[model samples]
Target: TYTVALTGGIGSGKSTVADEFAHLGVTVIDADIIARQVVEPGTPALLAIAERFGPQMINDDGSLNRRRLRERIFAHSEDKAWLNALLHPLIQQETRRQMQASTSPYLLWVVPLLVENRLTDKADRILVVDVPKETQIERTIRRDGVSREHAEHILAAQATREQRLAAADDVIENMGSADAVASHVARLHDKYLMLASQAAS
Candidate 1:
């Protein structure tokens, strides 16, 4: 199946685009969802995470302590790398497995950090959901209940707007309304389906 990576900075609406694509019959594989799965209690990966980070990373309910874990990992390069080391291979394995099982003509891999992680090598195409830096900061602060500084810090850590746009095989501009973004995605879906059909022959 044709594989496409949907990526963007925080608050850029990549997830929104992915959901719309799913409604249009595209197989959507979300990295954020996979990230959560790898760390659920009783998984070997979670056991490894607890070993590396400690028992506090697991909550009483058996789910991972997401807030504590995020603060720990995102604050330090070593911690982040360690977390990635534990999770990346597993995520990729599961993603590939699911893609193989999907009957859809195309698969949309929603990866928020595709550019930062340099993971586009596996993607047949890269679709970037884009918004202005200011808009990103504004939306993130409102939606995530973070300070402007904190939101900006998160934005600064990701690939720059120019970088993401330059890397995209297709751009889904999200500076407009949700309906406008939906219209763009609808067009792209038709375009990709046509491409997939031609390739199948």
Candidate 2:
């Protein structure tokens, strides 16, 4: 039942780090995936989202129009608060539900907003993927196709690197060194396996 909450800033290479663990047969329950599933067409939450944000927020295929929704939440503080208020609790319940179903020695709960949402208590340990602010800005611009200003703006909304590091039980300074990441993940995998076996006793 031990869960490691893996978090990082937007462009900190969290998915890449998690993928390394996955290839080692680790179970990764991504909060981002759960968030999308939570609002899939048949859900009450999706209906509410369509109502509050206007039907334009739903696609012709009856899925959430995520890009449009992201813009609205990013641009308006009140809208952001409103959506978070509606989604946060539901996501937490689903987070717990999903993690409980994992059969792995130790599970990685990949949650980008783990610290920002103050859900530190949800995990046995916190693992942070870190990179310099400039690295984040540079990578985010390239990945998200946003201007430098927008990338910085997105980073501003998250917990600072210092704050995240302070809360981490483990840190992966993901500097995009290919071999370095696999080696780092292997080390942690062994460490978590040992810890998990001890906890079983």
Candidate 3:
């Protein structure tokens, strides 16, 4: 199926764009959702995570203690690398499976690390949600309730703005009103429908 891999740096409003497309009846396969799924209770990925990071990473109810794990991984590069190595493959596999099962004319595969992890080839085209760095930092701080320092740290850890823009097959300038963003997505939705139809024929 024709696919658009939607990506952007943190707080770039990728989810907002995805929601717009979803409202148009497009299938949305989100990496974040799949990432959480991989580490859910009884999954092999969760088992590996508990083994590698110890039982403390698992909560009392058997769900992954994501906040605790996030703290450990962010503080230590090696720990972050270990977790990514274990979880990324499983996430990718499940994402592909879900994408294949999608019945829409085209699917939106939302992956925040598409450029950072060099997973752009996962889609037939790439759509990047663009925003200024200051906007990103401010939005992240407000949305996540994190300090400016913490938000900046997270942004620093991801691919730069230039990198994400360079990787885009199409770009949505997301620093605008909601209706404006939705209008942009509507245009893209029509374009994607044509593209998917052409590919099918």
Candidate with maximal lDDT:
2
lDDT of 2 by residue, 26-99 (tens): 88998788888889987889899888778888999999998888888788868877888889999999988877
Give model 2's TM-score versus the native structure.
Answer: 0.73
lDDT of 1 by residue, 1-201 (tens): 777888888888678789999999888988678778877779999888788778888899988887878777777767777777888999899877877789999888887554545655667788888888888999898889999999989888877899889988899888667788888899999989887888778
In angstroms, the error of model 3 at 15 is 1.2
Lowest lDDT 10-residue stretch of candidate 1: 112-121
Clashing pairs in 2: none
Instruction: After the best TM-score superposition of candidate 2, give how far the Cα of residue 58 lies from its true spot, in angstroms.
Output: 4.7
User: Please, what are the lDDT tens digits per residue for candidate 3 over residues 1-201?
Assistant: 788988888888778889999999898988678888888988888888788778988989999998878887788778777777888888889987987778889988888554545554568888999999999998899889999999999999888899879978899999768898899999999999999889888
Question: Residue 26, candidate 3: how far off, in angstroms?
Answer: 1.6
Ranking by lDDT: 2, 3, 1
Q: Any residue pairs clashing in model 3, and if so which?
A: none
The TM-score measured for candidate 3 stands at 0.73
* Candidate with more favorable, higher TM-score: 1 or 2: 1
List per-candidate RMSD values in Å. Answer: 3.6, 3.7, 3.8
For model 1, the stretches where C-alpha displacement exceeds 4 angstroms are: 41-56, 70-89, 114-120, 143-145
Model 3: per-residue Cα lDDT at residue 196? 87
